[PDB]
Design a protein around this nucleic acid. Structure first.
Lengths: 258, 171, 134, 184
RNA sequence: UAUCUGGUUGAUCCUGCCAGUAGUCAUAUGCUUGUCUCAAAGAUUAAGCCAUGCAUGUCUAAGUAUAAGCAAUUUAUACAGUGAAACUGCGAAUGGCUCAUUAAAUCAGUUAUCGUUUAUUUGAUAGUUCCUUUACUACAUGGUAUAACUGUGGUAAUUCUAGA
RNA sequence: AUUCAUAAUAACUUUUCGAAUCGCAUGGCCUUGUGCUGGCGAUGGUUCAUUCAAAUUUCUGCCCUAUCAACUUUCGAUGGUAGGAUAGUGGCCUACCAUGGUUUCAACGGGUAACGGGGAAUAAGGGUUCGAUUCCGGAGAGGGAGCCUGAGAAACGGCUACCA
C-alpha cells in the first residue's frame, strides 16, 4: 500500500452496520467526512439496509442525486457519506425525520425525530483552541467548527448546535450527575449518570456511571457523551432509554410481547 | 532514412539517443512526467537525409506554384474577443459580436453560418458575479466584525461578573 | 390462475422513488405457475394504475407448487416507472428495447485499437493511402 | 474474494469400528426404523452426543447461575418442542437419560407409520420420498424431517398426491387409457 | 465421547518398540457413480518461461468546441442542442495476484507524535489585491502562446512523428 | 508538562495567497441607463480543524542449531556537540571528540523444506502439529539500482541503465 485505501471488504467492515456476510465481497467504504470511518453510518447502508427505501446501490444513488436526502441542514449527494452519531438525517420528501443514535446493543437505531428536535443537535467538543487573529473556537465530534464559544465551555462538555447556523446555543458542563450516552467500547449505547471520575495523569480518564437500574459500569472519558441533566435529556432517546437488560430479561420481554 | 527527425540544437551529423522530455520536440509524453529514450538525427545537414524541410524567408524573382504563387486561408478566424479586436484594428468601443467571422457551412441545401463563440466577452453575467463577490466579501467582513464585538462585550461582562464574585468573596 | 387471491404485504410507500413497494405472494393451486403479464395486470387493477406502472420481480415458486413469492413495485406514473426502472427490466416488461452494444471482447478490442490512434486520424488515413499507392 | 461459506460434518464414525455388540444393536435400530445406512445412526448418535455434552456441562454448573438457567432453559425448550423430551420429564438430567431411539421415534418416517398412514416403516419412507406426505399443508420429502410437538395434527397426505384427492397418478392413468383403448 | 488390541515365550510377568484403530476446510491416486444445496482448485516442484486476447480510464447544466459531424437555430447573427477529436482537471499509488526475500525483521497486543507530512471529505477562515504603498490597475476585465484541425512529408515496421 | 496555542516588535523573501472561472435564474430600484442593486449554485483558494491516511516510535512475545563463544569498532560500531538532510525524530549523513555497545538470562554466526497474526486439525486436563490460501498487516512484478509527475510511487499493466 503506497497511498490511501479506497476499498472495503465486508468482513473488514464494522459489524454494527449489520451488513450480511454473503451479499457480495465488498462493503461501502465511507468516504472521508466529519466522522471516523468506523462509528459512522454511510447513507448507502442507512437507506438500503435500515429503511429499505431502496434495494440497490443504483437506487440509493438515484435517491441521493434527486436530493431527497439531506444530512443535518445541508443536502448531501455522497452515496457513502459518513453520517455519524449525532447526525440528523432529514428526508424531507417523505416528511420523515431521524437522528442517528445507538440502541442498547450497540447499533445505530432508526430513531425517528420531530422537526422541532431535527432543527438542532448536540455536540461534545473534542477541543477548545485559539484560531488566527486570537479567535477562540471549538470543534465538535462532528468536525463542525464554532467560533467565539461561551468562555465557560471546556473540552468534552456538550454543545447544542443549531442546524440553521452552527453556533453555540447552550452548553452542559461535565460534572457528577449529568446524563451521559456511552458511545463505544463494550457499553456502547448505555445511558447513565456520572458518579465521579478518576482523572488519571497521562493515563486514560475514567468515569463511573450508574443508571436507573443501578447497573453501574465504568467507561473511558474519550467514550462518553453528556446529553443533559438527571433523567432529562436534551433530545429524545431511542427505544428503552438506553437500559440494558440481561439475556434472561430480553428473553422474558420477547416472550411477553409474543 | 528510417525516418528519424532531425532534432534542433544537437550539433553533430550522426544519429544519437536523447532522453526526450516534455516541452521538447520529437516526442509526445503518453503519461505525465514520462521521459523516453528516443533517437534523433543531428541538426547538421548530411547525405543521410531523405527530405529537407525548408521555408522561404525571401521570395525569388520567379514563381513556384506550390508556393508564393498560390495561398491558403487562415483556416479559423479569431475566437477571443481581444483577438478579434486586434485582427480588425478596432478601438475601445468597437463591438465584436458582429465582427465575428460568420463562416458558412452548407449541410446539403441547409446553409448557415456557425460563427465561433467569443471568450473574455464583457457580459452582464460576469458583472453580476463580480458584484456578488464584492457583496459576499463585505458581508463576511461586517458579520465577522460584529460577532467579534459581541464576544468582546460578553468577555467584558464575564470580567465584571468575576469582579462582582470577588466582591462577594473577601467580605 | 385458479384462485390467485394475490396477497401483498409490507406495503411501505417511498415518495423518494414515488412508488409503493410490497412483498407479493401468489397462490396458484392446480396450476403450475403465474407469469409476469398475469401478475402485473392483476396488481395494476387492484392498485388503480396502468399495467406498466406496476413492477414485479423475484418470484420463487415454493416447494410442492401451490404458491410463490416475488417482490412488487407499483409506481406513481408511467413516466416515473420509465425513469426508475432498469433497462433490463423494461425490456423484460416489453416496454423498452434491448441496447445493441457489442460483446465485451469486441467492444474492448475497439477501445484498444482506437487507443493506438491519436486524434481523428483523418490525415493519417490520407497519408497511409498515399504511401500504399506509392 | 467472497467471505467463506461455513460448513461442518453432522456425524462421527465410531472408534473400534467392529464391536459385534454395537453392530448388532445398530442394525436392530436400522431394521426397526427403516434407515438406509449406518450414517443415519451415526448422525443421531452424534446429535445425541452434542446435546449430552452441553447438558453435562450445564448440569455440573452451579445452580441458578445465569448461564446455566439461560442455556438450560433453551436446551430443554427445543427438546420438548421437537417432542423428543416429554413435559413430565422437564428437568435437565433427563436429557442425559435420552437415547438415540428417542430421536429416531420422532423422525418423519416413524411418525407417518405411527399415525397409521403407512403400511410399515419402509412403506413409510417410499411414501415420504415420493412427495405423498405433507406437514402443515406443504409437501415435505425429507424422511429425516423432525416433527415439532404440534405438527402431528397436520401430518397427512399431500393435496398434490393421488392419495390426497389429486389427479389419479401416472401408471393408473396410463392403465386407464389402455383399458379405454382396449375397450375402444 | 479420560477405553485400547495382535506381535519376543514351551508357558509367565515386564521394559520396549512394530503393527493395528479413529480423525484431518490434508495432499495425491485407484475403482465406481443417480439427484439437491454449497464449493475449494497450478501454493507445494519452477517468484521457471510466456504466444494470443482482454484487465484504467473518465464529463455534467455548471473549463475550453465554428468537426469542413448529427438534428434543428420552429431560442437567437457571437455561443446556444447533441457530439467525434483534442487540450484541461482528476485517477491511474485502490483493487487483483503471489509468498521469493525477511528470525527482534515482519507481525500481535499495547503505546507516543510536546516529533512530523497529508490530495480529498467536513466545518469554519482573506476590506490591508494601491504595497515599487490610490491607478504597476482596462477593471464593462489585461497579455501571450499551443493543442484539436488543414496541407507537404519521412520510416519495412511502433500507441514514431518533422517542417508550415 | 512545554520555547504550546495565540498575540506583540524589527526587518527579509529570488515571493505564496487573497478569484480576469462556469451553469441556471433573471427579481427589485428608479435619476429608464443595455444604469445601480439581486438569488440558487458549480469550480477555485490561504490558515486552522476534521476525516481518510502516512512515517517513525515505547513495552513484551518468535522455529532448530555451541559440529557457531565471543561479536561490533578499516571506511559507524555506542555516545557527546555542531551542521547538512529529511515533511519530521535519529550516526540518517558529515566534522571533531570520548571508548564505548551486545553476550552462557545463548550475543554473533548457520539452517529453515520460515511472510507474521485472526486462525485450522486433534485432545479429560496439560498439550502436539499445521496456518502458501477468502480477513488484517508486510514485501515483490525476472534480479538490482536510479528517477520523473503527483498529495501519495523507488510505481514496474511508468520511464532510465546494467544483468538474464
Amino acid at each position: 500500500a503506497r497511498g490511501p485505501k479506497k476499498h472495503l471488504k465486508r468482513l473488514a467492515a464494522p459489524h454494527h452496520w449489520l451488513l450480511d456476510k454473503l451479499s457480495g465481497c465488498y462493503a461501502p467504504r465511507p468516504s472521508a467526512g466529519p466522522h471516523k470511518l468506523r462509528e459512522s453510518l454511510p447513507l448507502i447502508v442507512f437507506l438500503r439496509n435500515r429503511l429499505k427505501y431502496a434495494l440497490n446501490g443504483r437506487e440509493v444513488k438515484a435517491i441521493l442525486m434527486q436530493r431527497h436526502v439531506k444530512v443535518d441542514g445541508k443536502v448531501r449527494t455522497d452515496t457513502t457519506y459518513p453520517a455519524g452519531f449525532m447526525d440528523v438525517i432529514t428526508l424531507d420528501a417523505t416528511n420523515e425525520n431521524f437522528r442517528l443514535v445507538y440502541d442498547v446493543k450497540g447499533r445505530f437505531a432508526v430513531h425517528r425525530i420531530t422537526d422541532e428536535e431535527a432543527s438542532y443537535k448536540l455536540g461534545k467538543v473534542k477541543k477548545v483552541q485559539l484560531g488566527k487573529k486570537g479567535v477562540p473556537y471549538v470543534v465538535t465530534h462532528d468536525g463542525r467548527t464554532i467560533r467565539y464559544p461561551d468562555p465557560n465551555i471546556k473540552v468534552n462538555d456538550t454543545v447544542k448546535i443549531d442546524l440553521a447556523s452552527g453556533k453555540i446555543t447552550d452548553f452542559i458542563k461535565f460534572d457528577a450527575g449529568k446524563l451521559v450516552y456511552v458511545t463505544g467500547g463494550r457499553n456502547l449505547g448505555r445511558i447513565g449518570t456520572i458518579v465521579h471520575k478518576e482523572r488519571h495523569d497521562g493515563g486514560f480518564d475514567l468515569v463511573h456511571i450508574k443508571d436507573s437500574l443501578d447497573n453501574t459500569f465504568v467507561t473511558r472519558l474519550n467514550n462518553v457523551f453528556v446529553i443533559g441533566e438527571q433523567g432529562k435529556p436534551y433530545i429524545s432517546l431511542p427505544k428503552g432509554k438506553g437500559i440494558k437488560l440481561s439475556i434472561a430479561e430480553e428473553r422474558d420481554r420477547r416472550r411477553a410481547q409474543q | 532514412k528510417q525516418g528519424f527527425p532531425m532534432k534542433q540544437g544537437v550539433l553533430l551529423p550522426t544519429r544519437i539517443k536523447l532522453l526526450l522530455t516534455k516541452n521538447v520536440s520529437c516526442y509526445r509524453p503518453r503519461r505525465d512526467g514520462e521521459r523516453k529514450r528516443k533517437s534523433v538525427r543531428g541538426a547538421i545537414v548530411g547525405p543521410d537525409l531523405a527530405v529537407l524541410a525548408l521555408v522561404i524567408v525571401k521570395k525569388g524573382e520567379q514563381e513556384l506554384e506550390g508556393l508564393t504563387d498560390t495561398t491558403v486561408p487562415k483556416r479559423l478566424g479569431p475566437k477571443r474577443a481581444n483577438n478579434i479586436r486586434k485582427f480588425f484594428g478596432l478601438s475601445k468601443e468597437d463591438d465584436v459580436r458582429d465582427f465575428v467571422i460568420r463562416r458558412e457551412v452548407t449541410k446539403g441545401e441547409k446553409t448557415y453560418t456557425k460563427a465561433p463563440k467569443i471568450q473574455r466577452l464583457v457580459t452582464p453575467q460576469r458583472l453580476q458575479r463580480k458584484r456578488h463577490q464584492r457583496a459576499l466579501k463585505v458581508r463576511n467582513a461586517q458579520a465577522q466584525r460584529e460577532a467579534a464585538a459581541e464576544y468582546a462585550q460578553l468577555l467584558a461582562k464575564r470580567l465584571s461578573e468575576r469582579k462582582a464574585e470577588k466582591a462577594e468573596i473577601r467580605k | 390462475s385458479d384462485a390467485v387471491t394475490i396477497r401483498t404485504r409490507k406495503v411501505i410507500s417511498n415518495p423518494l422513488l414515488a412508488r409503493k413497494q410490497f412483498v407479493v405472494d401468489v397462490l396458484h393451486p392446480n396450476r403450475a405457475n403465474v407469469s409476469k403479464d398475469e401478475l402485473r395486470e392483476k396488481l395494476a387493477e387492484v392498485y388503480k394504475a396502468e399495467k406498466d406502472a406496476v413492477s414485479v420481480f423475484g418470484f420463487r415458486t415454493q416447494f410442492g407448487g401451490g404458491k410463490s413469492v416475488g417482490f412488487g413495485l407499483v409506481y406513481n406514473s408511467v413516466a416515473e416507472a420509465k425513469k426508475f426502472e432498469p433497462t433490463y427490466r423494461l425490456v423484460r416488461y416489453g416496454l423498452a428495447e434491448k441496447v445493441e452494444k457489442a460483446s465485451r471482447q469486441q467492444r474492448k478490442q475497439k477501445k484498444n485499437r482506437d487507443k493506438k490512434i491519436f486524434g481523428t486520424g483523418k490525415r493519417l488515413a490520407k497519408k497511409v493511402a498515399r504511401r500504399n499507392a506509392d | 474474494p467472497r467471505a467463506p461459506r461455513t460448513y461442518s460434518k453432522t456425524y462421527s464414525t465410531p472408534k473400534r469400528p467392529y464391536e459385534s455388540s454395537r453392530l448388532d444393536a445398530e442394525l436392530k435400530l436400522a431394521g426397526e426404523f427403516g434407515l438406509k445406512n449406518k450414517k443415519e445412526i451415526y448422525r443421531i448418535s452424534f446429535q445425541l452426543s452434542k446435546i449430552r455434552r452441553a447438558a453435562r456441562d450445564l448440569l455440573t454448573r452451579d445452580e441458578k447461575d445465569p448461564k446455566r438457567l439461560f442455556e438450560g432453559n433453551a436446551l430443554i425448550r427445543r427438546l420438548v418442542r421437537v417432542g423428543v423430551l416429554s413435559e413430565d420429564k422437564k428437568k435437565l438430567d433427563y436429557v442425559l437419560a435420552l437415547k438415540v431411539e428417542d430421536f429416531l421415534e420422532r423422525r418423519l418416517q416413524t411418525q407417518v407409520y405411527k399415525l397409521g398412514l403407512a403400511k410399515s416403516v419402509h412403506h413409510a419412507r417410499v411414501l415420504i420420498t415420493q412427495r405423498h406426505i405433507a406437514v402443515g399443508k406443504q409437501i415435505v420429502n425429507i424422511p429425516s424431517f423432525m416433527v415439532r410437538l404440534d405438527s402431528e395434527k397436520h401430518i397427512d397426505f399431500a393435496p398434490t398426491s393421488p392419495f390426497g384427492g389429486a389427479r389419479p397418478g401416472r401408471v393408473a392413468r396410463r392403465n386407464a387409457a389402455r383399458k379405454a383403448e382396449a375397450s375402444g
